[PDB]
Amino acid sequence: ASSLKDEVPTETSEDFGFKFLGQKQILPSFNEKLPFASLQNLDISNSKSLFVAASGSKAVVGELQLLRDHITSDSTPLTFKWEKEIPDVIFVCFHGDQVLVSTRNALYSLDLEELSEFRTVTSFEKPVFQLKNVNNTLVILNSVNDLSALDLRTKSTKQLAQNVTSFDVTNSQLAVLLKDRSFQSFAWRNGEMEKQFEFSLPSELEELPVEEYSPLSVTILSPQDFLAVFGNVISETDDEVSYDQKMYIIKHIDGSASFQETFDITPPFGQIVRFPYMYKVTLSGLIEPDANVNVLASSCSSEVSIWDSKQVIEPSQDSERAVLPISEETDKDTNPIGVAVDVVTSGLPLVYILNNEGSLQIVGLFH
């Protein structure tokens, strides 16, 4: 049923580029010891004009205009509204008038109107790898490969799926990557789901042994496309590290998925031990009415890619590529631990990217 097609091609575009707005250490470094989970340690609320960020055991909520000005000029110091030392944070995000903070072992709430209140929401029976917030629900992937749903209004928990190694959600879809390397997609509506479609790997891809090319990651790019990654399985504690990964764009047309390789999305040259996770920011309407540009980055890479809905886009010149810095301390490549979009500050949408070293980069994506 599933087929392997030709390499996805790369367009050189003279209409796309990044403008490097600036970079500064705003939080303490992880010194190369990061929590073995997918990390989402930066969020931005354009309505409130605020950000949360967590690096090196320090979590903060702060004013967005301040962070912008701190990074882009050299005259305004970074102060915060709230801060707390929390060791193992993997997830940070605004929800209503609250900020959710999650470690591997527990979820926490900070009340944005009474900052004195830092509540435990819940504990997890087993360590967690990934969390996504959709509306009033938190979708949680377990260390035992159990996909579950937390209602934020009622605190009750549903069991969604099993044997999952990666998942992704939008407002209306839920995708799942399984241990057997098969895929599943569901229509999603406020905790509720109905199987949309299902597929296995193409014959020529099963040829690659599961042990060498393990299921690492899914990303919904559109209701029809996915981006999947397969690669070596990495251990919680290992000093030395090399990543070997294969990326595929899956377009599902009429009961048949096609897979296609890229070598141009997020090449995994990383040298810090990281749990595999694909960062995605969506800018709908940056080209046209059914066209959302997706900016992509990886826990295992220093490069930032662009997907235009149909192919990968390289800017026509080297100053126009978004890349995360080499460390001034270790001389190693850094990777993102959070990514977020700023639409409201004053001086194109602005992509904020947070390091494994607490450094934050602002990059304007133009035309």
Swiss-Prot record:
Q: Where in the cell is it found?
A: Nucleus, Nuclear pore complex; Nucleus membrane
> Start-end of the FG repeats?
228-231
Chain segments carrying region Interaction with DBP5: 2-367
PXFG repeats located where? 267-270
Classify the source by domain of life: Eukaryota
This protein's domain notes: Contains FG repeats. FG repeats are interaction sites for karyopherins (importins, exportins) and form probably an affinity gradient, guiding the transport proteins unidirectionally with their cargo through the NPC. FG repeat regions are highly flexible and lack ordered secondary structure. The overall conservation of FG repeats regarding exact sequence, spacing, and repeat unit length is limited. FG repeat types and their physico-chemical environment change across the NPC from the nucleoplasmic to the cytoplasmic side: SXFG/PXFG repeats are especially abundant in NUPs on the cytoplasmic side.
The further comment given in this record reads: Present with 1230 molecules/cell in log phase SD medium.
Q: What does this protein do?
A: Functions as a component of the nuclear pore complex (NPC). NPC components, collectively referred to as nucleoporins (NUPs), can play the role of both NPC structural components and of docking or interaction partners for transiently associated nuclear transport factors. Active directional transport is assured by both, a Phe-Gly (FG) repeat affinity gradient for these transport factors across the NPC and a transport cofactor concentration gradient across the nuclear envelope (GSP1 and GSP2 GTPases associated predominantly with GTP in the nucleus, with GDP in the cytoplasm).
Assembly information from the UniProt record: Component of the nuclear pore complex (NPC). NPC constitutes the exclusive means of nucleocytoplasmic transport. NPCs allow the passive diffusion of ions and small molecules and the active, nuclear transport receptor-mediated bidirectional transport of macromolecules such as proteins, RNAs, ribonucleoparticles (RNPs), and ribosomal subunits across the nuclear envelope. Due to its 8-fold rotational symmetry, all subunits are present with 8 copies or multiples thereof. Part of the NUP82 subcomplex, interacts with NUP82 through its C-terminal coiled coil.
**Protein's name in the database:** Nucleoporin NUP159
What is the protein's species of origin?
Answer: Saccharomyces cerevisiae (strain ATCC 204508 / S288c)
Q: Which gene encodes it?
A: NUP159
State start and end of the fragment within the whole protein. Answer: 2 to 381 of 1460
